[PDB]
Design a protein around this ligand. Structure first.
Ligand SMILES: [Ca+2]
Ligand SMILES: [Ca+2]
Length: 481
């Protein structure tokens, strides 16, 4: 298969991880003050999200400093030629669920990008739909002037010698809203506070690099059954970003739709175009879908995504989008025979990709909402349209996965099995997966996050262990393509 482990490097002994108990609506205001670190959603916050990016012979990695009492934003640069790892500790510390640092908040990843055009570094972090509000608000005024958190460096910072890779490469907030001399968090990416409302209430920072070396970024507004993707672009010449522009309208019921809907999926820049693939969550609570339904896909012929959107058949899409029917590919709910209200459960197991040969691939998963019914049904689905085919092949002869990747002529499933990375590989446009790599010895891992580039998988991993300060490792896996 050609798949092999090319390197494994320890990046730190102590990154943040939530080792306490899971809280809920009833218990989150009384978190543990002892050594263990309670959390509200999941345990993962380091080596999680868009936190690993190669750049020339470097790999940059973000993480939160471990120890429940530490939690600083960290940036590490790994020189793959010399083996040196140099780390910058930022003043901002994870602020936790709704701003209480005693409750870990796994949405609040540290997204990362490096511009190949001027060597600037960009980080957006510790965000979950925050806004300006006051003591009576959901956030109790804890994010005033600080609801969007962006740090960035001067030009060329990515390439400085190790001795010079320091917090001094990054630009302080010196605006009228600066919180002090250690404030490295900018409220907008445009450099203009007049835009701050355009940066309000966002979650999930994710960066891409265009084929021309331009950085793209998108985030999600809202969530649940009323959400939207917003994207913007980096102007390297002026060292600032554009305002966010929507893929779809929020509040769709006020823009001409029968219902509001949310989006569960990803925008991705693939094959030289901004594209999107998702399952919707309609606000309709009377149809058969308790949560998500459908598979949806579109791509833009505009270099920055500003219009000229099309569905998989090349038909023009209303933009910003209002009615998801325009770009629907198929209905995974059709693969289970329940029809009563809320009887069909679709949440986990969705992802999509497009290969360099233009094969289109979706994976998803569907089960009965009622796990106790005697006619319980559960299926994983692989839908793919080979490069030259007219229609999608849709099959349940598939074991399911949380992600799908592509490089060269192949698609990949990459994850952990019993704590060890594995790789499954298939030809693009096919369902012929085979396990081609499986680590079998060494320290085991709790979780990780993957970036594909250069025909390699950069697998940024947290080692298994007790406590809330655990080691991080970078594995570089050659995918044999
Ligand atoms: Ca600030
Ligand atoms: Ca529904």
């Amino acid at each position: 298969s050609g798949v092999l482990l090319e390197s494994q490097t320890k990046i730190t002994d102590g990154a943040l991880h939530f080792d306490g108990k899971k809280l809920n609506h009833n218990t989150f205001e009384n978190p543990s003050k002892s050594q263990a670190y309670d959390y509200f959603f999941g345990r993962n916050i380091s080596a999680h999200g868009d936190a690993v990016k190669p750049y020339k012979h470097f790999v940059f990695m973000t993480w939160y400093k471990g120890g429940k009492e530490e939690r600083n934003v960290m940036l590490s640069r790994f020189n793959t030629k010399t083996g040196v790892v140099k780390t910058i500790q930022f003043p901002h510390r994870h602020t936790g669920f709704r701003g209480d640092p005693l409750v870990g908040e796994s949405h609040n990843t540290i997204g990362l990008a490096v511009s190949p055009l001027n060597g600037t570094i960009h980080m957006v972090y510790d965000m979950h739909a925050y806004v300006d509000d006051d003591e009576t608000g959901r956030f109790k005024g804890r994010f005033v002037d600080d609801f969007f958190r962006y740090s960035f460096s001067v030009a060329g910072a990515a390439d400085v010698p190790d001795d010079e890779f320091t917090l001094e490469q990054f630009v302080k907030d010196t605006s009228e809203l600066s919180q002090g001399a250690d404030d490295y968090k900018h409220l907008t990416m445009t450099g203009n506070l007049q835009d701050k409302e355009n940066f309000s209430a966002l979650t999930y920072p994710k960066f891409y690099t265009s084929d021309d070396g331009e950085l793209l970024h998108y985030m999600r507004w809202g969530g649940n059954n009323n959400g939207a993707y917003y994207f913007n672009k980096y102007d390297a010449k002026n060292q600032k970003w554009t305002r966010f522009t929507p893929f779809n309208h929020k509040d769709q019921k006020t823009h001409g739709n029968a219902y509001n809907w949310g989006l569960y999926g990803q925008m991705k820049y693939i094959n030289g175009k901004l594209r999107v693939g998702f399952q919707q969550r309609s606000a309709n609570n009377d149809d058969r879908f308790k949560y998500q339904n459908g598979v949806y896909y579109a791509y833009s012929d505009h270099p920055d995504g500003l219009g000229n959107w099309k569905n998989v058949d090349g038909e023009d899409m209303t933009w910003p989008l209002v009615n998801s029917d325009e770009i629907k590919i198929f209905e995974p709910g059709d693969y289970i025979d329940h029809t009563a209200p809320n009887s069909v459960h679709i949440v986990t197991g969705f992802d999509w990709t497009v290969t360099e040969n233009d094969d289109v691939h979706f994976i998803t998963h569907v089960r009965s909402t009622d796990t106790k019914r005697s006619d319980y049904k559960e299926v994983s689905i692989h839908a793919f349209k080979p490069a030259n085919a007219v229609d999608f092949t849709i099959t349940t002869d598939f074991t399911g996965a949380d992600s799908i990747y592509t490089s060269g002529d192949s698609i990949f499933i990459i994850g952990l099995k019993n704590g060890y990375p594995f790789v499954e590989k298939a030809k693009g446009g096919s369902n012929d997966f085979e396990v081609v790599y499986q680590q079998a010895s060494g320290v085991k891992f709790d979780h990780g996050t993957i970036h594909i580039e250069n025909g390699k998988a950069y697998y940024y991993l947290m080692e298994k262990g007790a406590g809330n300060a655990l080691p991080l490792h970078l594995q570089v896996i050659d995918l044999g393509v």
